[PDB]
């Protein structure tokens with residue numbers, strides 16, 4: 001677009017490249033996403049235009065939608081750091097628990113809002129979690145999933161992996177749970193490098209799901225009665241040194257059955273959020 005100048009490449013998103021851009025009329029700094037051809041579908045235009053009205057302080061603001069000369073451009077608010085880089089810069093000492101807790105609470109607020117409007121993230125990950133100097137964390141890449149680097153499977157819910165074509169809101173809760181454990185331990189919970197490896201890593205840690213813990217699991221599209229039977233591991237061995245309230249909350253976000261899995265609304269009422277404060281991060285720019 002004529003009104004923008006590329007300053008640098010922010011990264012490579014799911015639907016094309018993302019650039020740091022300066023506006024000419026405003027002088028504002030923005031995140032510009034060049035989307036993906038035939039002539040661009042109408043259905044995708046409406047789904048994207050619905051996202052402009054889906055505003056919350058914990059959702060990266062879609063400033064403008066630009067469709068010009070059979071190419072789509074998504075203009076987003078710019079944030080200085082992503083959670084993947086922040087976790088990398090906090091590897092030596094680890095993100096302090098008060099800050100981990102505030103980030104989780106705000107992300108849950110973000111999720112509770114999307115889920116109230118029947119909007120799923122589908123691909124929550126540190127990469128698409130953005131942070132500012134004020135202590136705010138925001139959800140990015142939202143609603144894009146509905147409308148050749150390797151895609152991370154680490155945060156994928158088991159029902160998606162088991163072939164469920166109709167994801168519920170619970171997939172976002174599973175993804176956020178994995179991020180939470182990772183923020184605590186400074187290591188990915190389930191670093192799978194293939195769908196079966198990803199699934200098998202979940203099975204080794206939380207036990208192989210059977211009809212007992214997940215009614216209707218054996219009838220799922222990709223479920224094989226031939227899967228190995230692993231016994232569950234206690235959460236104290238999974239996430240040390242997260243306290244009992246954190247472990248109990250994480251456990252509820254990581255429930256196999258999406259119906260038994262905690263909502264973003266009920267999670268905000270969990271005793272873990274009794275002593276929630278808003279610390280500011282120490283970020284280097």
Ligand SMILES: CCCC(=O)Nc1n[nH]c2cc(-c3ccc(O)cc3)c(-c3ccccc3)cc12
Pocket residue numbers: 010011012013014018031033060074076077078079080081082127128129130140141142144
């Ligand atoms: C050093 C720059 C740190 C950074 O990534 N900043 C970003 N500011 N704003 C941003 C907005 C987005 C974004 C991309 C697609 C969407 O549909 C929504 C948002 C991204 C972003 C880029 C790649 C993958 C995921 C998110 C990064 C930033």
